[PDB]
Structure formats: C-alpha cells, structure tokens
UniProtKB/Swiss-Prot annotation:
Its main location: host cell. Endolysin with lysozyme activity that degrades host peptidoglycans and participates with the holin and spanin proteins in the sequential events which lead to the programmed host cell lysis releasing the mature viral particles. Once the holin has permeabilized the host cell membrane, the endolysin can reach the periplasm and break down the peptidoglycan layer. Changing G30A: Almost complete loss of enzymatic activity. It catalyses: Hydrolysis of (1->4)-beta-linkages between N-acetylmuramic acid and N-acetyl-D-glucosamine residues in a peptidoglycan and between N-acetyl-D-glucosamine residues in chitodextrins. The keyword Lipid metabolism does not apply. This is Endolysin. GO terms for cellular component: host cell cytoplasm. The gene is E. CDD domains: T4-like_lys.
C-alpha cells in the first residue's frame, strides 16, 4: 500500500463534476475546484486546470494527472511548512502517509491548526494523539475516513485499509 492507493480509497474517482461532503464542486480523485456555488465557476476552473474545454467531464488520465499534482503539492507543502515539517521528519514511513492524507483533505493551514495532536505525534504518544485527533469537526463530519487515518497514526500499519 502507498499514499496513492490510500488516497484513492478515501476519495474515490469521479469523472464528472460533483459535490464533495462539504457541498463543494470537485472532480477526479478529490480535486477541489472551487468553494463557489456556481457550477459555472466550477466548469471554468476545470477548463483552466485541464487546458481544454471539458464541459464538466474529464478522462481517467486527466484525473490521474491532477491527482499526481495534488499529492506532490501536499508533500511540498508539508516540507515548506514550519509547523508540519518537523512532525513529518520525526515520523516513520506509514505515519508519514497519514499526515499527507490529512493535508490533502484539509489543507496545510487546517492541519497546522491541530497544535496539540501535532505535539503528541512528535512525541510518539500514539494513543494520546488518537484520542485528541477525534475531538474535531473533521472526525465528526467524516468519521469513517477520520477513523482510518487515526488508526494509521495509532498503529503505524496499514490495517485500516487492508479491509477496503
């Protein structure tokens, strides 16, 4: 299992514009297009992103291309972030995947806001951090996906996904 497979399980693949859990316009493998209510604003962002007139629809290849960009950007974002980098550097390979997942879903800024959980992870207090992470809007809104991520941080294994 790797970050790509992990995220492909959590986000799904959709070739037509769709609304995410938060009601935002998305396409592909969790690629947010706009927080704007206009489908037209969405279709415009999409064409800009692909470089063609897509008319709200893309190919598998296009979705994967966006996906590669997003994971790359997520990684680079963590490495450039003063709050995130140190945590990342302190973690083992599987747990690193878990932080990437959170950043991909919630953005750098959002994850950087989990001050206490970050501190616990850095200190390798697995059980404590799992409990703290669950006290969030994130967990209440997308509980199955959050539990998967949380178990990943808790155990350092891919058990939560070996099911799926």
């Amino acid at each position: 299992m790797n970050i790509f497979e992990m995220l492909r399980i959590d986000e799904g693949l959709r070739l037509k514009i769709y609304k995410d859990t938060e009601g935002y316009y998305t396409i592909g493998i969790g690629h947010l297009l706009t927080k704007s209510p206009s489908l037209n604003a969405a279709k415009s962002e999409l064409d800009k992103a692909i470089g063609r007139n897509c008319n709200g629809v893309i190919t598998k290849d296009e979705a994967e291309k966006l996906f590669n960009q997003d994971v790359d950007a997520a990684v680079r974002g963590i490495l450039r972030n003063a709050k995130l980098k140190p945590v990342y550097d302190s973690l083992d390979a599987v747990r690193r995947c878990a932080l990437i997942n959170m950043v991909f879903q919630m953005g750098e800024t959002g994850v950087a806001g989990f001050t206490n959980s970050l501190r616990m992870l850095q200190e390798k207090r697995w059980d404590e951090a799992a409990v703290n992470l669950a006290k969030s809007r994130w967990y209440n809104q997308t509980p199955n996906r959050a539990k998967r991520v949380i178990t990943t941080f808790r155990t350092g294994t891919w058990d939560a996904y070996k099911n799926l």
